[PDB]
Amino acid sequence: SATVYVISGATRGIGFALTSLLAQRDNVLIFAGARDPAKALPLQALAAATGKVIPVKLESANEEDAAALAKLVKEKAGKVDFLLANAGVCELNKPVLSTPSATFVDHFTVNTLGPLTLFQQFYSLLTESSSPRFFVTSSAGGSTTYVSMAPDMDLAPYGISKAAVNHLVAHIARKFGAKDGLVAAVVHPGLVATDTRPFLEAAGLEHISPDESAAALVKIFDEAKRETHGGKFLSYDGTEIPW
Amino acid sequence: SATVYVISGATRGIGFALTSLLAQRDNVLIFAGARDPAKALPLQALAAATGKVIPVKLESANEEDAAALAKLVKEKAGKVDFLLANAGVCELNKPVLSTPSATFVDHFTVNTLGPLTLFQQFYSLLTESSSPRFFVTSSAGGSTTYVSMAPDMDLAPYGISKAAVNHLVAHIARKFGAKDGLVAAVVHPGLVATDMTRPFLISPDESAAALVKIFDEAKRETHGGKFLSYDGTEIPW
Ligand SMILES: [Mg+2]
Ligand SMILES: [Mg+2]
Ligand SMILES: [Mg+2]
Numbered sequence A: 001s002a003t004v005y006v007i008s009g010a011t012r013g014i015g016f017a018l019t020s021l022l023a024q025r026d027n028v029l030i031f032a033g034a035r036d037p038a039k040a041l042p043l044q045a046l047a048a049a050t051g052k053v054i055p056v057k058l059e060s061a062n063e064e065d066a067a068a069l070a071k072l073v074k075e076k077a078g079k080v081d082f083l084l085a086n087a088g089v090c091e092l093n094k095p096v097l098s099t100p101s102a103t104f105v106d107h108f109t110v111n112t113l114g115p116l117t118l119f120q121q122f123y124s125l126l127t128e129s130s131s132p133r134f135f136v137t138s139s140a141g142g143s144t145t146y147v148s149m150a151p152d153m154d155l156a157p158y159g160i161s162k163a164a165v166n167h168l169v170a171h172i173a174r175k176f177g178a179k180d181g182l183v184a185a186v187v188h189p190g191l192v193a194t195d196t197r198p199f200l201e202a203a204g205l206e207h208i209s210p211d212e213s214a215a216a217l218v219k220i221f222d223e224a225k226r227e228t229h230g231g232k233f234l235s236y237d238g239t240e241i242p243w
Numbered sequence B: 001s002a003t004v005y006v007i008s009g010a011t012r013g014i015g016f017a018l019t020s021l022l023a024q025r026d027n028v029l030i031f032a033g034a035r036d037p038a039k040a041l042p043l044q045a046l047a048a049a050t051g052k053v054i055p056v057k058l059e060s061a062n063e064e065d066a067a068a069l070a071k072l073v074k075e076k077a078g079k080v081d082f083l084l085a086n087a088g089v090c091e092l093n094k095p096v097l098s099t100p101s102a103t104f105v106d107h108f109t110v111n112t113l114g115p116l117t118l119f120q121q122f123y124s125l126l127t128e129s130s131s132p133r134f135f136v137t138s139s140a141g142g143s144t145t146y147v148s149m150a151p152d153m154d155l156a157p158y159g160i161s162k163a164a165v166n167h168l169v170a171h172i173a174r175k176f177g178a179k180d181g182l183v184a185a186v187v188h189p190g191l192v193a194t195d196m197t198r199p200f201l202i203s204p205d206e207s208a209a210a211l212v213k214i215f216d217e218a219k220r221e222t223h224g225g226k227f228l229s230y231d232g233t234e235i236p237w
Helices: A013-022 A041-050 A063-076 A101-127 A156-180 A197-203 A210-223 B015-023 B041-050 B063-076 B101-111 B113-127 B156-180 B204-217
Strands: A003-007 A028-034 A053-057 A082-085 A133-137 A183-188 A233-235 B003-008 B028-034 B053-057 B082-085 B133-137 B183-188 B227-229
Touching (some): A003 A013, A013 A028, A013 A210, A041 A053, A053 A063, A063 A101, A082 A101, A101 A156, A101 B101, A133 A156, A133 A210, A156 B156, B003 B015, B003 B063, B003 B113, B015 B028, B082 B113, B101 B113, B101 B156, B113 B156
Parallel strands (some): A003 A082, A028 A053, A082 A133, A133 A183, B003 B028, B003 B082, B082 B133, B133 B183, B183 B227
């Protein structure tokens, strides 16, 4: 009967803040992914505090971890209602001419293939939900339209990988949206920081805390319907972002 | 002296019609890339006929091949005026649900990192041109805007990789348009995605004539950072 969430990237930043906010609800079950859950002590403490969180092993783009978690979720809950992809990487200061191809591949693997692997391994569980949702936390930095509307931040590997994941989610919405009643969408969380902030400062960057971003994102997730949200690029502030 | 073109995928999709059209112009020198020049007999026949085409080895995303070609071009010509990235891969029947990650990586490596590697290795030569141009070919499948209403051809690895390269080209235009006056853009030849990579292929000759019109007229303020159809209009990202 519980609403079932699977949240990747749940040890840090927006993934942790989403897990913490949702864990305060009455009838939910949250599988919170960590590369190494036994050492994810704040996730263990949230599990103790709420009883709504199961910390689980989930490395980005690792097909074995994703398949194992789907097996666990199948046994424990039998469905997934919200699949929330929040395990990202954004390496600073990667100018296009002096950055090796491997850095581009690494961002593609985590930011594009990570969500791909989650959707592929969890699709059957999403089909068991009456109203399945798949939200990938992307970035306005992945908007190609915004490239000519924003200054260069030396973040091409990141932006490229987010443009790629945005295209992937559009393909998922087209294929499965109507068939399964699935809302598949990407969401810009804002510029997230806590002091975390020296990272955005070292990037060259309107700041919102992870908790404030999570509060806005869950409102979008809760209200989403296919006709208004399926296949869209949403922002935490309610607006739509061009691709 | 001659306007220098470097064309990856010169035997694939629109690349051959493009190489053939440009090769019949005055005062050009065309380095026409192929994965295996020994296998590209019609390209050798064009080089025999025009005297303006140099067939060269260029495997996509191969840094050694691109660096070797750049050394060759620097010696013969000392500059590149037009870098035209037309190599690519578009494997059929790759639905999202069942296609392994390796296939997506393969398409990203060829279709996204191929053009990146070309740009990295030829950047210095482009800056020697009085009006450097860098164009990447794509199909409508790379437009994320078009996905929701377009027919699903099970070409997700291709489309994702082209959305990625479109973003890379926009980033290159933003930085190097301002720094070097580079015109960097993506063009849609009007071919289907599955024709984009067929060896020695709107017809190709009509598409090539339309594209060279865009290449010749390109200016940074009107073409830089854009996704252009062969017909002059813009395609949403
Ligand atoms: Mg409680
Ligand atoms: Mg693997
Ligand atoms: Mg002639």
